[PDB]
């Protein structure tokens, strides 16, 4: 489904995203905002390495989830890419946490550097009371 700004903020906080590995809820919101406009069904193909980004955090099926047709698939989240397109974002969140587990952090998503880094991300959570 398509979350409302503050609704997602409350949900992410509920799922332990606030401060996870130093990443503030504000930063996670800004990420979801530009990656999928808060849409759990958002999917994007990559006519390069032939992979696909799934869910609110646009997690790629090449190294994180298994869609069943991507070269060099590792599926570190040990999840089916379809599980990252449900109204309940528990699985997508856990796989997102897996992604930032690595040294690159949230900078793994180029959109963060371009749309969130050194920006007033507080606004994404402002007025939500989180």
């Amino acid at each position, epitope marked *: 489904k398509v979350f409302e700004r503050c609704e997602l903020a409350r949900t992410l906080k*509920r*799922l*332990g995203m606030d401060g996870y590995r130093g990443i503030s809820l504000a930063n996670w919101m800004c990420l979801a905002k530009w990656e999928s406009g808060y849409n759990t069904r958002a999917t994007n193909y990559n006519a390069g390495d032939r992979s696909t980004d799934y869910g609110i955090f646009q997690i790629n099926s090449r190294y994180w989830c298994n869609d069943g047709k991507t070269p060099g698939a590792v599926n570190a989240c040990h999840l089916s890419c379809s599980a990252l397109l449900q109204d309940n974002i*528990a699985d997508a969140v856990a796989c997102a946490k*897996r992604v930032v587990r690595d040294p690159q952090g949230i900078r793994a998503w180029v959109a963060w550097r371009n749309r969130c880094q050194n920006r007033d991300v507080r606004q994404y959570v402002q007025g939500c009371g989180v």
Partner: nanobody
Framework: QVQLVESGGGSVQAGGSLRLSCSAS?????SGWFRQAPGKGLEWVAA????????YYADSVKGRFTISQDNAKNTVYLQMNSLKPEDTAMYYC?????????????????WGQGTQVTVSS
């Protein structure tokens, strides 16, 4: 972060039963139970994915122990039925935040204090 508090350990006769509890102070994604004999290593026993309720068991305990979760109490349990002397060990519950293979100890970042389970012949 997240604290895990265990309880329910005990000393029983062979064939006995116990119910271990692992209460969390915050959100947990995957929860699991591990056992350890004195001076030996940690061994995976069981796990459950809180999102879909999928459970996983070690061959040695399948059919005898049941892992469950009461979301309203944010607590995970290990119901140990038909205990055997070989089950004697200190049991630890653990939780993960990241997604991964429930059988991989590497993804568990939070651990309970442990509780002793002793089964006599």
């Amino acid at each position: 972060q997240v604290q895990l508090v265990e309880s329910g350990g005990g000393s029983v006769q062979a064939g006995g039963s116990l119910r271990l509890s692992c209460s969390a102070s915050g959100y947990t994604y995957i929860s699991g139970w591990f056992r350890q004999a004195p001076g030996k290593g940690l061994e995976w026993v069981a796990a459950i994915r809180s999102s879909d309720g999928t459970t996983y068991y070690a061959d040695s305990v399948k059919g005898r122990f049941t892992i469950s979760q009461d979301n309203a109490k944010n607590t995970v349990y290990l119901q140990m039925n038909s205990l055997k002397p070989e089950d004697t060990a200190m049991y630890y519950c653990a939780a993960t935040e990241v997604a991964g293979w429930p059988l991989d100890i590497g993804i568990y970042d939070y651990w309970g204090q442990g509780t002793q389970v002793t089964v006599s012949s």
